């Protein structure tokens, strides 16, 4: 983990060392050009967390009577809901761990009693459904039913504001991939043909780094488990 300022220094003394958006001392990016990097940086982090299952985070959802669709939005969180239009929040989080709507793909759902709940099983009456990728639907809200949703999560969105996040938590082996994508976005913005050729090199380099990580499995992406169907099938 490191501050976004270190990212600015690394870009200043890295791929963007010969650009006009760096300071005279090569210590930081130009202040007016900082939001350009921030937008690209968030985009790059989203792609990395999609190809690689690096972060697995879980959330707690409380079933409310008379409600079937449960969007996973921060406006329904207890720490961020507005009482004027929301009767009561159903997403529970902590003051220092506010929900940031980092949901990418739902993996599994367990209720408060410890039973696995099938998802998108059309032939199963008790199964849950997801009409939208970030919306959870329950067709039978009970009295004290509480659901826990474990999902693949993206990195929290960076922001230059003081209250916003200002740290990066990614495997250090993917740092060249992050720099390459940011460099690709910058050089692609310039429409000069010379910059276009340079932009493609970084994008190709970024893809090469990603496949190298997959080839050696440096992020423990591959997962195996002991066989259980042998007992269930009754082979004995």
């Amino acid at each position: 983990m490191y501050y976004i300022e270190e990212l600015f220094c690394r870009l200043a003394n890295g791929v963007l060392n010969n650009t006009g958006i760096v300071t005279d001392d090569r210590g930081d990016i130009e202040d007016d050009s900082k939001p350009f990097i921030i937008v690209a940086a968030n985009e790059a982090l989203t792609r990395l967390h999609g190809r690689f299952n690096m972060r697995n985070n879980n959330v707690v959802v409380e079933m409310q009577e008379g409600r079937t669709n449960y969007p996973l939005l921060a406006k329904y969180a207890v720490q961020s809901y507005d009482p004027n239009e929301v009767k009561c929040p159903f997403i529970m989080d902590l003051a220092g761990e506010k929900f940031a709507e980092d949901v990418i793909r739902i993996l599994e759902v367990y209720d408060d009693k410890g039973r696995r709940r099938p998802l998108n099983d059309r032939n199963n009456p008790c199964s849950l459904f997801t009409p939208r990728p970030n919306v959870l639907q329950n067709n039978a809200p009970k009295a004290w039913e509480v659901l826990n949703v474990m999902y693949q999560a993206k990195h929290p969105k960076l922001s230059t504001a003081e209250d916003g996040y200002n740290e990066i938590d990614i495997p250090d082996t993917l740092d060249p991939a992050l720099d390459a994508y940011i460099a690709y976005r910058y050089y692609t913005s310039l429409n000069t043909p010379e910059s276009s050729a340079k932009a493609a090199e970084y994008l190709s380099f970024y893809d090469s780094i990603c496949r190298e990580v997959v080839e050696y499995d440096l992020t423990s992406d591959t997962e195996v488990d002991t066989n259980t169907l042998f007992r269930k099938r009754g082979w004995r």
Binding site: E62, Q64, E65, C88, F90, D112, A143, W144, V146
Partner: protein, 72 residues
């Protein structure tokens, strides 16, 4: 008649615990919702120890509350 239960409604730090002890989430949510009550006792634990150290001291004077009023 009609059911009336739930976590978002009909639940507060003031009411008492229900019969649903077995639910692990309920008891954890029970204490978490009543966190400030625990915090108020915790940070002032020093005062309670001194008072408890003289617990029997305040019991004896309690036996003659009316008699002490005669002097005043």
């Amino acid at each position: 008649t009609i059911p009336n239960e739930g976590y978002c409604c009909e639940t507060l730090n003031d009411p008492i615990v229900d019969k649903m002890i077995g639910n692990a989430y309920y008891v954890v949510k029970f204490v978490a919702l009543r966190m400030p009550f625990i915090k108020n006792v915790s940070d002032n634990m020093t005062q309670l120890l001194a008072i408890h150290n003289k617990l029997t001291e305040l019991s004896a004077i309690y036996t003659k509350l009316d008699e002490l009023q005669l002097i005043h």
